[PDB]
Write a protein that binds this ligand. Structure first.
Ligand code: CLA
Ligand code: CLA
Ligand code: CLA
Ligand code: CLA
Ligand code: CLA
Ligand code: CLA
Ligand code: CLA
Ligand code: CLA
Ligand SMILES: CCCCCCCCCCCCCCCCCC(=O)OC[C@H](CO[C@@H]1O[C@H](CO)[C@H](O)[C@H](O)[C@H]1O)OC(=O)CCCCCCCCCCCCCCCCC
Ligand SMILES: CCCCCCCCCCCCO[C@H]1O[C@H](CO)[C@@H](O[C@H]2O[C@H](CO)[C@@H](O)[C@H](O)[C@H]2O)[C@H](O)[C@H]1O
Lengths: 312, 226, 221, 85, 213, 41
């Protein structure tokens, strides 16, 4: 196998000893300060890995675990936005009147008079009116409860710990070799296929099974505590057939290629939903389905270990 | 030691046939320590002898009277005529002290073999104790020992193990159907297809509590399901 | 080699030992050069064995209450499907156990931390598990060189496979029924999601009308 | 469905690719295509031990079954969109 | 060769078997330095001492409840003795802090200097506050029965038994608070609730321990 | 963890512990003593 897993076991010993020595990465900065330019060169040359060493394998290992550090920080960030949307928000109120209640997800502590920033955003709530658009994401995902926001915040903390452990593992315990990184055909096949293709197929699954029925019941006008939970939308095909009457035919039109019968919930409407001013979620559903098929086709392009495929 | 518990098994190293009833057994490693093996030998002898008493009590009390049932034979209502509705506290006091004597004498025979043989009140005749768990002397009033002690020792252990399985049978064929052992044997011999282990396991005829003169005893079966 | 789908790259090192070997490694996960982590060949063989015997216990145990209720040997209260046992309470929970399923689950937690961390500490530390006091029972747990096959006086009760060739045949046949039963568990789960019926009821419905009741006529047409 | 106008497109479009790659009319694992459009021998990057005489591996089966399903889905849905079936 | 908290894993290097109740349990390497470990041995001891006193306190005052005596529960005994007995509360707190600040700073400057606190600077006591080792002061006051001298092997046995009972009394005092923050009643009422029905009156049916009820 | 305590004694870590200390001291003061414009008694 030319394309194969190839790592190195225990390359870098996990120790706080080099945290005690600032400038350990640099040949010039390791002697310590004599001059305040040292402490700016410490922070400027900190992530310039190509100037630390000349070994491209070590540079690739450092930049592959720094990406797990960035991913763990993004999962801390996303999980914090879900947590602040759960515990400090008017999102429960915002779902009942999303035209007269301002989206707020940041509340300040009343100390030095800064509690004037807790303005009257509506829904019996005081906080800072957010503008990052998370409440519209959460309506488009079919959340309808701050319990789901709290649990995906806990899942984001778990996934951030997974990313931090992953960077620790793939730098300190089992770090990949150089010719692992140089398999760009396999990286493109897996990223077009698995990241982009399977990710939009999975979001197509969430849009077909969760967000289309929940947002259809919202647009018809139903209280969010009256809407069936989305696990009661997975298990009960009868509710989905009440909402979209081609779920009664099952996945039989998909394998008999009678896909036009799926036109109840995969559409090509275009324009806007006049109830809510957004895109039709059946249209975005068929969008991510077609994007998924396209990128799963595109991720079978490059030659890795069998003679089929292109080499770049 | 030979003719082990299964045909194709190698015996453990600590089971070379010195003890009686030795079948190359212990597939859970419990006798691997010698001081643990002597105590487990003593506890097997204790469970064997009390289980033989249990079997020869349960299948004799229904021979002499097949009306008083052995499960509730411990209730004061079911005791015989000179002991009916006795205070069970005083009876428990008699049993507690008269057993805390005997069992601690036997325990100190375990902890220091040979130091407990003399009658302590009557500083005279001892008990000739050849090996641990087999005192003799006055525990052989008929003198069936002082012959082939290994033969009768294997006989005692085999009848004792069979009586252990028999007595834990006698309880479980009485929790499922609420019926004595000879009476459950007669119930099998009546209809040997609906009065078996099938359609009797799963029910527990034991009540949850019985008030014995003011005390409630928890009274559990060994499997779930009433 | 056997099992077409095998390649030449998964055949040079892969010699003929390592029981259940047929060369079928089309991705080359088991490959000793530059390996590491959980893609070590020892961990992969060990986890195939563990997945194998858990799945064959599960493959007997999903089909057993429905078969034994088809014979009437167990009552109809315990004739339930495997996914309605309480493992998936959205699919259905049997309420006639002796406890809450979370009581039973905490008992399972304690029993399986003791069953599994001990199981791992002989993979990590092969000489261990007979050293500390564990109620005298540590004489069982000495194991052997191979972590997937300890074979003490308990794990190899009847001492089956005395000779080396019979032991290799038994290690082969265990993996054979284990791979068949891993596929059987995959075809219990994916076949109980799609149908909604038990595996034995799927077998009875396939033996009733094989053409009109199969995978093709189960897409709810 | 069996014998209908959509089954006959799908089977005859999958078996067409499975007979194309075997009989030298489509690229395989063992055989690729040059900078022009000429059918040339490969390196295969692992070596195959296929007992089949043309080296037609199961990887070729998956590749040309995916290609035949792609051509069949394209022809079936295009004939549904053109009106003629 | 000695028993470890997690069988298989070797004990760490700073934790050879010489302390009472040693089982190699330091995954976070907090007592890696010998002097910080010297301080945490003292801390584990005195937390165990107060937890053994506290656990015996809760268990005795809860045997006092539910049998028929007038004793309160342990979470109610703070109010009932400052209200039944006319006790001003912040002066009871300040008297506690005075007496125990004395008794604690004596120990705190025994740790900083082991031969100190014994020069008769106190009311004329020289050997009685000498201190035998870390967390085991001894002498005529802290060991009036004199069990730290005599048979030394039985004294090491008592050291390990003290540490064992202290560990599970710390666990019990962490558990009384959780039994009260979960159920809201007495600990020996929780025991009799677990004994009247062994199933269904455990922690998994309390609604608070597992949220997936 | 001697190297961890030397890391805890570096300049930015001492800076971010001491500034949280002197921040959360003045913040608790301005909670328990609201709005001090003038030195009162
Ligand atoms: C990068 C993401 C991010 C950001 C910018 C914030 C920002 C904030 N959080 Mg938040 N938080 C996050 C992630 C994040 N959080 C995550 C992942 C969790 C789950 C553990 C929380 C859980 C959380 C709680 C429970 C609370 C906040 C609070 C706060 C506010 C004050 C924090 C403070 O005073 O520090 C405190 C100072 C030190 C810790 C030192 C501030 C707006 C507080 C708030 O909004 O009060 C109304 C509050 O009570 N956060
Ligand atoms: C189908 C397989 C697959 C998938 C899904 C990914 C996905 C990813 N790779 Mg990647 N990669 C793959 C195969 C795959 N890779 C192969 C085969 C190679 C070797 C040729 C590489 C080499 C490679 C490098 C060198 C780098 C990446 C990076 C990334 C990340 C890009 C950032 C992003 O979009 O975040 C999207 C975020 C998510 C999708 C969150 C979900 C997280 C999932 C669970 C982890 C990703 C799937 C993982 C590969 C499965 C392995 C599980 C593990 C237990 C073995 C992304 C997580 C970059 C990165 O950020 O590294 C951390 C990076 O530097 N990849
Ligand atoms: C990764 C994405 C994903 C996942 C996990 C699922 C999962 C599921 N789908 Mg689904 N589906 C998906 C994408 C996905 N779908 C897409 C992209 C479409 C459009 C073609 C559909 C159209 C679809 C229909 C029409 C039906 C399902 C059904 C089902 C359920 C049973 C599947 C079965 O019978 O076998 C299961 C929950 C069936 C069901 O009962 O759902 C409630 C059903 O009737 N799906
Ligand atoms: C409690 C009763 C008891 C005890 C203490 C022993 C003790 C002993 N037996 Mg023994 N045995 C018993 C009952 C008992 N036996 C019964 C009922 C049978 C018939 C099946 C046998 C058959 C038997 C054979 C054939 C041999 C022994 C041997 C031994 C010795 C070595 C094994 C060892 O170390 O185990 C120590 C045992 C324990 C520490 C007790 C553990 C009990 C566990 C925890 C519970 C049992 C599980 C379960 C509830 C049992 C269900 C019974 C029910 C279905 C009736 C040891 C002296 C060997 C011997 O004589 O070597 C000299 C030997 O060859 N035993
Ligand atoms: C070894 C597998 C096994 C397991 C785990 C159970 C488990 C159970 N059986 Mg059961 N049973 C089994 C085999 C098994 N049975 C067999 C082989 C027969 C014959 C029976 C006959 C049987 C009866 C007759 C009854 C049970 C009942 C029960 C339940 C309470 C006891 C419990 C769920 C009882 C129940 O609640 O239903 C009950 O009445 N079982
Ligand atoms: C950017 C993403 C990324 C990439 C490219 C890699 C790449 C690699 N990892 Mg790594 N890893 C990652 C993220 C990533 N990892 C994360 C997030 C973790 C923490 C959970 C780990 C933990 C980890 C360990 C512990 C090990 C590796 C190993 C490996 C190597 C071989 C992996 C392999 O064959 O898996 C192929 C895939 C599998 C074996 C299946 C894994 C099962 C997963 C959980 C299911 C699929 C996940 C899917 C993407 C999303 C869930 C689907 C679900 C929603 C339906 C390779 C160097 C191994 C190695 O050789 O050491 C270097 C190894 O031992 N990684
Ligand atoms: C272990 C072997 C095995 C066996 C003997 C069966 C037997 C059966 N399956 Mg099953 N199945 C299996 C594995 C197996 N399956 C696996 C691995 C999966 C996951 C892909 C499935 C998924 C599955 C579904 C989803 C359905 C069946 C159905 C059926 C029944 C009708 C026959 C059709 O076949 C179907 C066979 C396959 C889909 C693939 C078989 C592949 C293995 C390797 C052979 C029949 C009783 C149908 C039913 O309930 O009637 C039905 O709807 N099976
Ligand atoms: C003989 C069999 C047959 C028949 C009769 C049809 C018939 C049809 N196909 Mg079709 N198809 C077939 C085989 C067949 N196909 C096969 C084998 C495949 C697999 C490759 C496809 C894949 C396929 C797709 C993916 C689509 C069709 C569509 C269509 C329908 C409308 C096409 C049209 O007018 O768009 C004319 C439209 C344009 C010319 C606009 C093109 C502009 C694009 C969007 C942007 C291009 C981006 C960029 C600039 C590209 C640069 C690269 C380029 C230079 C190569 C038509 C009924 C379409 C459909 O379903 O519509 C309802 C559709 O989207 N077909
Ligand atoms: C008026 C209230 C003031 C009272 C002052 C009390 C403290 C007085 C004080 O300094 O201590 C008075 C002395 C202080 O200690 C004396 O200090 C002197 C110089 O400082 C000399 O060194 C004396 O030798 C030394 O005794 O205390 C004692 O020595 C008391 C010893 C009593 C011994 C009793 C042993 C008990 C054992 C019996 C148990 C069986
Ligand atoms: C390991 C497994 C890999 C994945 C395998 C995927 C399955 C293969 C794709 C489907 C093959 C043909 O697809 C299709 O043919 C069958 C005909 O027999 C259809 O079967 C049925 O079709 C209609 C209802 O749906 C009815 O009018 C037909 O009476 C009935 O035969 C199935 O609806 C469909 O599945």
């Amino acid at each position: 196998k030319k394309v194969k897993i190839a790592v190195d076991r225990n390359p870098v010993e996990t120790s706080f000893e080099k945290w005690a020595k600032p400038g350990h990465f640099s040949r010039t900065l390791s002697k310590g300060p004599n001059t305040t330019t040292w402490i700016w060169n410490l922070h400027a040359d900190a992530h310039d890995f190509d100037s630390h060493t000349s070994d491209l394998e070590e540079i690739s290992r450092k930049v592959f675990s720094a990406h797990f550090g960035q991913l763990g920080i993004i999962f801390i960030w996303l999980s914090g936005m879900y947590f602040h949307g759960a515990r400090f928000s008017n999102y429960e109120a915002w779902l009942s009147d999303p035209t007269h209640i301002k989206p707020s997800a940041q509340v300040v502590w009343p100390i030095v008079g800064q509690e004037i920033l807790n303005g009257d955003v509506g829904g019996g709530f005081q906080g800072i009116q957010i503008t990052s658009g998370f409440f519209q994401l959460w309506r488009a995902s079919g959340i309808t409860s701050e319990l789901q926001l709290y649990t995906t915040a806990i899942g984001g903390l778990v996934m951030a710990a997974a990313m931090f452990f992953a960077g620790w593992f793939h730098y300190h315990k089992a770090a990949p070799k150089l010719e692992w990184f140089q398999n760009v055909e396999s990286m493109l096949n897996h990223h077009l296929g698995g990241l982009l293709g399977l990710g939009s197929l999975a979001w197509a699954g969430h849009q077909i099974h969760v967000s289309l029925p929940v947002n259809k019941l919202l647009d018809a006008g139903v209280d969010p505590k009256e809407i069936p939970l989305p696990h009661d939308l997975l298990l009960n095909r009868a509710i989905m057939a009440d909402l979209y009457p081609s779920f009664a035919k099952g996945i039989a039109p998909f394998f008999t290629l009678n896909w036009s019968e799926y036109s109840d919930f995969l559409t090509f409407k275009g324009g806007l939903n006049p109830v809510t001013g957004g895109l039709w979620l059946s249209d975005t559903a068929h969008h991510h389905v077609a994007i998924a098929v396209l990128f799963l086709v595109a991720g079978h392009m490059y030659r890795t270990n069998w003679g089929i495929g292109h080499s770049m | 030691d030979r003719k082990l518990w299964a045909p194709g098994v190698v015996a453990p190293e600590y089971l070379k046939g010195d003890l009686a009833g030795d079948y190359g057994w212990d597939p859970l490693g419990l006798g691997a320590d010698p001081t643990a093996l002597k105590w487990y030998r003593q506890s097997e002898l204790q469970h064997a002898r009390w289980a033989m008493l249990g079997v020869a009590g349960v299948l004799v009390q229904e021979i002499v009277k097949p009306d008083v049932y052995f499960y509730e034979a411990g209730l004061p209502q079911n005791l015989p005529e000179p002991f009916t509705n006795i205070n069970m506290g005083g009876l428990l006091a008699w049993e507690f002290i008269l057993m805390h004597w005997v069992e601690v004498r036997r325990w100190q025979d375990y902890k220091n073999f040979g130091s407990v043989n003399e009658d302590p009140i009557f500083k005279g005749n001892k008990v000739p104790n050849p090996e641990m768990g087999y005192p003799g002397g006055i525990f052989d009033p008929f003198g069936f020992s002082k012959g082939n002690l290994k033969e009768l020792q294997t006989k005692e252990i085999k009848n004792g193990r069979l009586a252990m399985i028999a007595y834990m049978a006698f309880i479980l064929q009485a929790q499922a159907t609420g019926k004595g052992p000879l009476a459950a044997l007669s119930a099998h011999l009546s209809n040997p297809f609906g009065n078996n282990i099938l359609k009797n396991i799963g029910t527990c005829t034991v009540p949850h509590s019985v008030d014995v003169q003011g005390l409630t005893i928890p009274l559990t079966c060994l499997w779930p399901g009433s | 080699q056997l099992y077409v789908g095998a390649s030449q790259s998964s055949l040079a090192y892969l010699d003929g030992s390592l029981p259940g070997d047929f060369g079928f490694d089309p991705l080359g996960l088991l490959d000793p050069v530059n390996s590491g982590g959980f893609i070590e060949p020892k961990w992969l063989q060990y986890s195939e064995v563990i997945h194998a015997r858990w799945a064959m216990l599960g493959a007997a145990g999903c089909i057993a209450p429905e078969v034994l209720g088809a014979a009437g040997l167990i009552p109809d209260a315990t004739n339930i499907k495997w996914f309605e046992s309480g493992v998936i309470p959205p699919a259905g929970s049997y309420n006639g156990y002796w406890a809450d399923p979370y009581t039973i689950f905490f008992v399972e937690i304690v029993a399986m931390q003791f069953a599994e961390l001990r199981r791992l500490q002989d993979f990590r530390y092969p000489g261990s598990m007979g050293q500390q006091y564990f109620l005298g029972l540590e004489a069982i747990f000495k194991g052997s060189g191979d972590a997937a096959y300890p074979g003490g006086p308990f794990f190899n009760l009847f001492n089956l496979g005395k000779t080396e060739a019979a032991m290799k045949e038994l290690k082969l046949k265990e993996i054979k029924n284990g791979r068949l039963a891993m596929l059987a568990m995959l075809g219990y789960g994916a076949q109980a999601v799609m149908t909604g019926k038990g595996p034995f009821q799927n077998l009875v419905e396939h033996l009733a009308d094989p053409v009109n009741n199969n995978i093709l006529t189960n897409f709810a047409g | 469905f069996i014998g209908s106008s959509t089954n006959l497109i799908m089977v005859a479009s999958t078996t067409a690719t499975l007979a194309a790659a075997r009989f030298g009319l489509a690229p395989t694992v063992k055989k690729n295509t040059t900078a022009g459009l000429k059918l040339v021998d490969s390196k295969n990057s692992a070596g195959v031990i296929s007992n089949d005489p043309a080296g037609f591996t199961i990887v070729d089966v998956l590749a040309m079954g995916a290609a035949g399903h792609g051509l069949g889905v394209g022809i079936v849905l295009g004939l549904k969109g053109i009106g003629a079936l | 060769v000695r028993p470890v908290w997690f069988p298989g894993n070797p004990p760490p290097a700073h934790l050879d078997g010489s302390l009472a109740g040693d089982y190699g349990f330091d995954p976070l390497f907090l007592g890696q330095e010998p002097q910080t470990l010297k301080w945490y041995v003292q801390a584990e001891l005195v937390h165990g001492r107060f937890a053994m006193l506290g656990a015996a306190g809760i268990i005795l005052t809860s045997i006092g409840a539910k049998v028929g005596l007038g004793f309160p529960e342990w979470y109610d005994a703070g109010k009932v003795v400052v209200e039944k007995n006319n006790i001003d509360f912040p002066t009871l707190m300040v008297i506690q802090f005075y007496l125990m600040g004395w008794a604690e700073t004596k120990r705190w400057y025994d740790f900083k200097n082991p031969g100190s606190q014994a020069d008769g600077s106190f009311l004329g006591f020289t050997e009685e506050f000498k201190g035998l080792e870390n967390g085991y002061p001894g002498g005529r006051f802290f060991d009036p029965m004199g069990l730290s001298r005599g048979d030394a092997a039985k004294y090491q046995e008592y050291k390990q038994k003290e540490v064992k009972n202290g560990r599970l009394a710390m666990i019990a005092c962490l558990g009384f608070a959780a039994q009260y923050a979960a159920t809201g009643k007495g600990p020996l009422d929780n025991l009799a609730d677990h004994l009247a029905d062994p199933n269904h009156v455990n922690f998994a049916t309390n609604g608070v321990s597992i949220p997936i009820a | 963890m001697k190297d961890f305590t030397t890391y805890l004694s570096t300049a930015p870590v001492i800076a971010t512990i001491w500034f949280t200390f002197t921040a959360g001291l003045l913040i608790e003061i301005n909670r328990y003593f609201p709005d001090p414009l003038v030195f009162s008694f």
